[PDB]
């Protein structure tokens, strides 16, 4: 299935505070009014290309969508990033794991040869994520606040703030989702140009594309 993403996918690009200024930037962003691949994998998690950072969304208000596996070969030969949740802490493992046919998770383990690093951190709900990689730094953004501008559809404007940066420095090309045992979008992003309007308190209140319409 296909869906049209109205205006979602605008994030704070850097660590600079501003106030009441219209700032024009050129960076990787999700183009407005683009196509997204609505999945309804319920009673089906195919491998999807990475292609320079991806969007991610969901609408279920419980712990069924758990983990995101990233890699380039899906084997113990090359290190694979695992991000999974335990309802109390987020554990990130960059060590080499083997393939999983039908992993089940919720609150798979094959082998951990050549382990290097570990990390530990802390109408329904929408969990908008953006995963980006550049110059050996892997940035993960997030937003966990849903606004019911319209029902059953993701319409409205929201900003994304950075939650974690990883200085891992790995090459990845393929990422997959992990589920339990018994409805997430995907979108790709391009190097576009935006104009952003800041509030008095430094919050992004409006974004305008620079390559869409003559008025734009």
């Amino acid at each position: 299935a296909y869906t049209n993403s109205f205006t979602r996918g605008v994030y704070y690009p850097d660590k600079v505070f501003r106030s009441s200024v219209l700032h024009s930037t050129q960076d990787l962003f999700l183009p407005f009014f683009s196509n997204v691949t609505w999945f309804h994998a319920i009673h089906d998690n195919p491998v999807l290309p990475f292609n320079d950072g991806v969007y991610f969304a969901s609408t279920e208000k419980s712990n069924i969508i758990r983990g995101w596996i990233f890699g380039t070969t899906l084997d113990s030969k090359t290190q694979s990033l695992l991000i999974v949740n335990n309802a109390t802490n987020v554990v990130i493992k960059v060590c080499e794991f083997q393939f999983c046919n039908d992993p089940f998770l919720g609150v798979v383990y094959s082998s951990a040869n050549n382990c290097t690093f570990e990390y530990v951190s802390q109408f329904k709900n929408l969990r908008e994520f953006v995963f980006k990689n550049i110059d050996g730094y892997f940035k993960i953004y997030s937003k966990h606040t849903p606004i019911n501008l319209v029902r059953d559809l993701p319409q409205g404007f929201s900003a994304l703030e950075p939650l974690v940066d990883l200085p891992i420095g790995i090459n990845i090309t393929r990422f997959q989702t992990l589920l339990a045992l018994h409805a997430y979008y995907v979108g790709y992003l391009q190097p576009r140009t935006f104009l952003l309007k800041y509030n008095e308190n430094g919050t992004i209140t409006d974004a305008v594309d620079c390559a869409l319409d003559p008025l734009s």
């Binding site: 704070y12 660590k15 600079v16 505070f17 501003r18 690093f117 110059d135 430094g202």
Partner: protein, 416 residues
């Protein structure tokens, strides 16, 4: 200074601009994040048991903030000599990761650990690469190895013709019987264990005492840096012209408290054209404010070299609270156009002679600065049935000068 700038020995009446002043900085401050996540280097050096040289122990260290100065000055080491790296600068470098090598050797085998060296253990148990190694630390261990250590708990390998490549371990225990012609022409004989035990006794000498040896190998420019040395910080000052180095952001200015509020993830704000205007200090997490230090040009008002030799000096656009022979001078006069010193202030008002600005202009009667007078003052007695008619006339002659031309010049092109 006026004569220098004009490059003449005579100066006419007027105002001239000689130079400009600025407020010099006083001290420097640098600040860094509150906590300092240390590294588990303690378990390395103060470990209980170290394996043999042929099976020396590896470990990988990264994403640390470790200080070598606290270890460099420690006197509990027999020898600490490093190759190509100044120890005092060890706190000012960042590496991708390090590998730590731990074992124990004899007293006389210390010198064998060096690149491009010859020896039994330098080529048969561990080979140093033909480049710079991090460096080797060695310290005495007779009190815990030559007194309570096991008699044969430590081993080496007396196995030849198998020169190991750098960073190679052969923990495979195979009996060395060739089983071919070049061993007494027999098979089975000449079967000698490739390894051998150390023979040590309590206080058996210097070259046979146990020595704990740890080798640190560094990796630089292989990846973004994750392990670095700690950086010292200092307290802050307020309302003084200071240069600062907040977390790599360097600049000069005066520090004030700010009423703004930041979202919990920014680091420093700005207003326009990449001019920093607010930073939050890592220790206190309080939002501050930066203001550029005052500066500005000076000017001299002089009535003319021919007439007199006294001048009045005016600083432009500076509130006269810190001017600093004209430190105190004479009656300081603060106006909207800066601060004027060397001249008196009068209550009267006259014509304008030497323009200064903000409606004031000084003159030489000493030098007096007053408020500009617009001219005379009168009111005509308007009335609805009275007119005034002249009765006499005069004829005057005026002059008016107008330029119409200038010199026709020409410069040669290639000759110049």
């Amino acid at each position: 200074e006026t004569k220098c700038t004009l490059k003449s020995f005579t100066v006419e009446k007027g105002i001239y601009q000689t130079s400009n002043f600025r407020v010099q900085p006083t001290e420097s401050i640098v600040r860094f994040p509150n906590i300092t996540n240390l590294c588990p280097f303690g378990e390395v050096f103060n470990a209980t048991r170290f394996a043999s040289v042929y099976a020396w122990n590896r470990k990988r260290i990264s994403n640390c903030v470790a200080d070598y100065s606290v270890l460099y000055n420690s006197a509990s080491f027999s020898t600490f000599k490093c190759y190509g790296v100044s120890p005092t600068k060890l706190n000012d470098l960042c590496f991708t990761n390090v590998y730590a090598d731990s074992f124990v050797i004899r007293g006389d085998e210390v010198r064998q650990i060096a690149p491009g060296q010859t020896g039994k253990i330098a080529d048969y148990n561990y080979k140093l690469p033909d480049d710079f190694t991090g460096c080797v630390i060695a310290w005495n261990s007779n009190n815990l190895d030559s007194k309570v250590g096991g008699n044969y708990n430590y081993l080496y390998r007396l196995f030849r013709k198998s020169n190991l490549k750098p960073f190679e371990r052969d923990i495979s225990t195979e009996i060395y019987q060739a089983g071919s012609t070049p061993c007494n022409g027999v098979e089975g004989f000449n079967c000698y264990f490739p390894l051998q035990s150390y023979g040590f006794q309590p206080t058996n000498g210097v070259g046979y005492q146990p020595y704990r040896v740890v080798v640190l190998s560094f990796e630089l420019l292989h990846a973004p840096a994750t392990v670095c040395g700690p950086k010292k910080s200092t307290n802050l000052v307020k309302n003084k012209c200071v240069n600062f180095n907040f977390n790599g952001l360097t600049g000069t200015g005066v520090l004030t408290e700010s009423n703004k509020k930041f979202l919990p993830f920014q680091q420093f704000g700005r207003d326009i054209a990449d001019t920093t205007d607010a930073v939050r200090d890592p220790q206190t997490l309080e939002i501050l404010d930066i203001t550029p230090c005052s500066f500005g040009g000076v000017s001299v008002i002089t009535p003319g070299t021919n007439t007199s030799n006294q001048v009045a000096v005016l600083y432009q656009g500076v509130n006269c609270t810190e001017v600093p022979v004209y430190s105190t001078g004479s009656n300081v006069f603060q106006t909207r156009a800066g601060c004027l010193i060397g001249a008196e202030h009068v209550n009267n008002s006259y014509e304008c002679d030497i323009p200064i600005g903000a409606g004031i202009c000084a003159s030489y009667q000493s030098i007096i600065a007053y408020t500009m007078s617009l001219g005379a003052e009168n009111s005509v007695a308007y009335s609805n049935n009275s007119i005034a008619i002249p009765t006499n006339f005069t004829i005057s002659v005026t002059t008016e000068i107008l330029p119409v031309s200038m010199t026709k010049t020409s410069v040669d092109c290639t000759m110049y």
